[PDB]
Amino acid sequence: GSHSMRYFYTAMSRPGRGEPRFIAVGYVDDTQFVRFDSDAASPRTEPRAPWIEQEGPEYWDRNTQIFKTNTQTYRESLRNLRGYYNQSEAGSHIIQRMYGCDLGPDGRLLRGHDQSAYDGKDYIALNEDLSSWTAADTAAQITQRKWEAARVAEQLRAYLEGLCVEWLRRYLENGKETLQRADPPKTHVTHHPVSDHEATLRCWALGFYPAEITLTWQRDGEDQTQDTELVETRPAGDRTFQKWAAVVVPSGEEQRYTCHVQHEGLPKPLTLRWEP
């Protein structure tokens, strides 16, 4: 059981359609648990998973105060970065930040993360030592100097090693029936002729959690990496995930093909064939 917590912030300017929108979401592994949106009728931190709802008024207020302050801070940062890049006010831009902590399985701080981006390009990241910064360009160097002056890295290290980890463990215990439960994929193999001489074998995995899974096709026991059409893992909407992998095979050669699935929730790895 290897777990993580992450917060994802998106700050987006929109001239002249009002002030930049700030939205924060928090996740434990593949489960979202909180959101904040500066655009909501009444901006407040809101629960998005049942196990967080037991947190009391003081938690909710604490969160909301931080995200409100961040709303104002990010609007200034957007102004600053527009300045650093000599950009016009025209002119819509995005700052993103993702930070958090990884635990081992095991249960102690494996490593911490804090990364920011500007218009979808790396801008500034906290190094794995949690003590120094990697700035992408001369603009991000300005941010770096400001962040050094305010001793941000030191504050982050203290959070990533302390609170981040402590609260992740509390969430894992509170939501243990779901967060610490791996649901194995339900699997099957479909067959659809494409022409007289070729057919598609599709290996399906449904209903699994967490999202991490490996689906491969083999011909005579060797990987078919270039020939496998692999779909991005997708949410079912009920916390579970879906994925498939397809190969096009010469008709008559179907039995030479095997599908292999690895997922934490499985007693042991699966080997599947098309079963006529």
């Binding site: 917060y7 924060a24 928090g26 938690y59 604490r62 969160n63 931080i66 995200f67 302050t69 961040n70 104002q72 801070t73 200034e76 940062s77 600053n80 970065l81 700052i95 930070y99 920011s116 500034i124 941010t143 400001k146 962040w147 305010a150 941000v152 504050q155 982050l156 959070y159 609170l163 981040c164 609260w167």
Partner: peptide, 9 residues
Amino acid sequence: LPFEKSTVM
């Protein structure tokens, strides 16, 4: 719980 310090970039 989120990081409690905000700092302008």
